Design a protein around this nucleic acid. Structure first.
Lengths: 83, 52, 85
DNA sequence: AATGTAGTCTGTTAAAAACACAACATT
DNA sequence: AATGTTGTGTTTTTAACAGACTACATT
């Protein structure tokens, strides 16, 4: 019933949940100040990698696939060094 | 040499809550008083909290 | 070396779990047209992260927003999105 | 007393959007 | 030749932002 799942079939939200529980444990007293961008970057880099292989480098097709502006797609690609 | 309220608070000996430090600015308890360029305050490096 | 990882028993980075979940999503694509894959992936990842940080701070919103490095308001607005108050 | 928080508001501004278009590419 | 895509500007629009402030809680 879940669109995004990883292999039993577990949803992606479970994989994220386990990763943070592992993250919080490893924090030996360190203070967190940027956890959102740390997670977003770990998820934006693969999803860009996948719709770019899907549309075979067609930026316009990949951007419309995600529902974002073509420049926004170009900007995020420049961010993660996918020129 | 000008820091934001967020940065200046962290540089202090005992950093407090952001809502409290903003009340300090509202209550003029910080000299030199920080100007407000746009939506944010800009503290001076030297600024401290004067006890009224 | 990677900061966010899962247990599979080897420690696989979370970027792998996302790569594998899209390869599976693309295989399920029986010719359908995808038009907002970003919002779909984001919603599947924002909701768990919100739950976990809020659990860690024991529901202290300010401590949770300070944790993620986002405005307290956008924390409140994102909690209202995924219905968590 | 002073500080912390949630909740509800304001402004300011940066990201994202929409669009335009000559260039080059693909079909 | 026709048609789509890139590259890269504009200009508009959305979403994040810092802050104000009150009632109530924690220290």
């Amino acid at each position: 019933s879940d669109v995004l799942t990883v292999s039993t079939q577990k949803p992606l939200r479970d994989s994220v949940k386990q990763a943070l529980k592992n993250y919080f444990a490893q924090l030996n007293g360190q203070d967190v100040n940027d956890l959102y961008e740390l997670v977003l970057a770990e998820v934006e880099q693969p999803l860009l990698d996948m719709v770019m292989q899907y549309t075979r480098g067609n930026q316009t097709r990949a951007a419309l696939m995600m529902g974002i502006n073509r420049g926004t797609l170009r900007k995020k690609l420049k961010k993660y060094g996918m020129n | 040499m000008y820091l934001t309220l967020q940065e200046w608070n962290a540089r202090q000996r005992r950093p407090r809550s952001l809502e409290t430090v903003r009340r300090w600015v509202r209550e003029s308890r910080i000299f030199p008083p920080p100007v407000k360029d746009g939506r944010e305050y800009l503290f001076h490096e030297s600024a401290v909290k004067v006890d009224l």
